[PDB]
Design a protein around this ligand. Sequence first.
Ligand SMILES: Cc1ccc(-c2ccc(CCN3CCN(C)CC3)cc2)cc1Nc1nc(-c2nccc(N)n2)cs1
Ligand SMILES: Cc1ccc(-c2ccc(CCN3CCN(C)CC3)cc2)cc1Nc1nc(-c2nccc(N)n2)cs1
Ligand SMILES: O=c1ccn([C@@H]2O[C@H](COP(=O)(O)OP(=O)(O)O)[C@@H](O)[C@H]2O)c(=O)[nH]1
Ligand SMILES: O=c1ccn([C@@H]2O[C@H](COP(=O)(O)OP(=O)(O)O)[C@@H](O)[C@H]2O)c(=O)[nH]1
Ligand code: NA
Ligand code: NA
Lengths: 229, 229
Amino acid sequence: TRIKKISIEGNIAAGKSTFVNILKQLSEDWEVVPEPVARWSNTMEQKNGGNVLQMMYEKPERWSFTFQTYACLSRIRAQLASLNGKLKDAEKPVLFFERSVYSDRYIFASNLYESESMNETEWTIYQDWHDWMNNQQSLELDGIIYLQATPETCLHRIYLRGRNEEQGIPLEYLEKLHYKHESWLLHRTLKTNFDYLQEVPILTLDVNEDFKDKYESLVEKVKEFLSTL
Amino acid sequence: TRIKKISIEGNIAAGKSTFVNILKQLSEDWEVVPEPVARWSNTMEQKNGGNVLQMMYEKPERWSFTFQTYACLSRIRAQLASLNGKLKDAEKPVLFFERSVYSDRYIFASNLYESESMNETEWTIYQDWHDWMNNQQSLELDGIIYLQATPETCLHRIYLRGRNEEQGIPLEYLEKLHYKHESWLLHRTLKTNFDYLQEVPILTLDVNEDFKDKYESLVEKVKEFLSTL
Ligand SMILES: Cc1ccc(-c2ccc(CCN3CCN(C)CC3)cc2)cc1Nc1nc(-c2nccc(N)n2)cs1
Ligand SMILES: Cc1ccc(-c2ccc(CCN3CCN(C)CC3)cc2)cc1Nc1nc(-c2nccc(N)n2)cs1
Ligand SMILES: O=c1ccn([C@@H]2O[C@H](COP(=O)(O)OP(=O)(O)O)[C@@H](O)[C@H]2O)c(=O)[nH]1
Ligand SMILES: O=c1ccn([C@@H]2O[C@H](COP(=O)(O)OP(=O)(O)O)[C@@H](O)[C@H]2O)c(=O)[nH]1
Ligand code: NA
Ligand code: NA
């Protein structure tokens, strides 16, 4: 029938990839679109993405615009392709997106503008492109699952995941991203050019406690949430 | 009925803007989409474009990717808007595009890559974005009118038009762009990811002689060309 689209949102190393790969396995009606940036961080997209990530570590204020535009186009095409290719013989089809087009802009790109890694012209061009690129759209979300963790939990999980380039990320940065997610998804204080988002259902899940071998209660809340949509 | 789409192609100051504003007036069935870059060179797009042009004059190797992506998105939306808003009560509707999506990539963006104003990653990202952005398309061309002028004619016409920032453009640069237009539109030696372009009809017009008050013979060739499409 109609595929349900659910974004999984959360800070760096909150556990979105872990959670998505749990969900993947529990039902033939449940599919997953991993975040392109996540995969680049692990082929022509993969080659461009690896180069942009490395370039960004050196000089965020030169590459933030290029990076954000490509990260968002790569997400849009990977999401469209899952919508068109998968779950068509399924009865209650669900697509779980690792993050969204809205996190790209209102979390990451916004944060880079706010750090002066994009200048006003780059941020304005980026918003114009984003506003327009997302009309020329059937990616509209049925609901958002927020994986809520403390900055400290995420900082610990960055250490656990043990990526060289990430070991430098400081608590202060994560506390910034955390704050943006609280404003957007909990207090719902964040305005956007996407009217329907104000009324989109949000499930908030506390993932401060390890869930890798103990996720039944989280999946129960996901199944209840899905029944309301 | 079905709007016919014709790109007007030519080197800098060949006379495309002059020619398009002649055509505009000759028929209620004839509409024109000026090139966004041309208008920026004369409002939020206008403000972004002015800033990007000025930034480009200072540092082409920093802004070529940002400039080319925005110039092409601005063209795509201005072309789409003319296709959807105009010529609907008209019997033999024609839209004349000042340049195309194909000149953006195969002339300008290509030329900037070739001058090392874009690095390989920027050029590859740009081509990926272009390939994909132009599927998510009803802008396909019925025919191309090539306004063919010598580099010297164009250099003279840059002096005539008398834009401060352009008075620095050297013959060598124009000879480069000229060569690209000859390869693409005359010898048809240039390959592209747009199969149909190999078979698109091209009218070549010599505009070395001033036509502003003497254009009847050119318009006669345009009307004959249109009757074949
Ligand atoms: C790879 C990489 C390299 C570098 C950076 C980075 C480093 C430092 C700073 C602060 C700059 N300061 C300059 C001086 N000032 C005084 C203070 C500030 C900002 C950024 C970040 C990333 N990853 C990102 N990943 C996304 C991302 N992830 C998913 C989705 C999506 N859309 N974007 C965004 S940044
Ligand atoms: C505004 C502006 C400022 C600057 C330039 C510019 C200047 C110099 C150079 C050569 C660099 N060199 C560096 C060192 N090397 C040794 C040799 C080379 C390249 C470029 C050009 C433009 N306009 C353009 N306009 C379009 C354009 N027009 C319509 C449509 C469309 N898509 N693009 C492209 S560039
Ligand atoms: O309940 C959890 C969730 C995550 N992790 C680990 O924490 C890191 C971050 O998880 P993930 O990469 O899924 O986070 P994402 O960036 O996708 O949110 C990884 O090493 C996980 O194996 C964990 O040990 N227990
Ligand atoms: O037959 C012509 C065509 C053009 N021009 C002048 O040459 C310059 C370049 O023309 P245009 O701006 O139309 O060129 P485009 O860049 O649009 O090709 C302008 O000053 C025109 O008025 C001219 O004097 N006679
Ligand atoms: Na599944
Ligand atoms: Na007209």
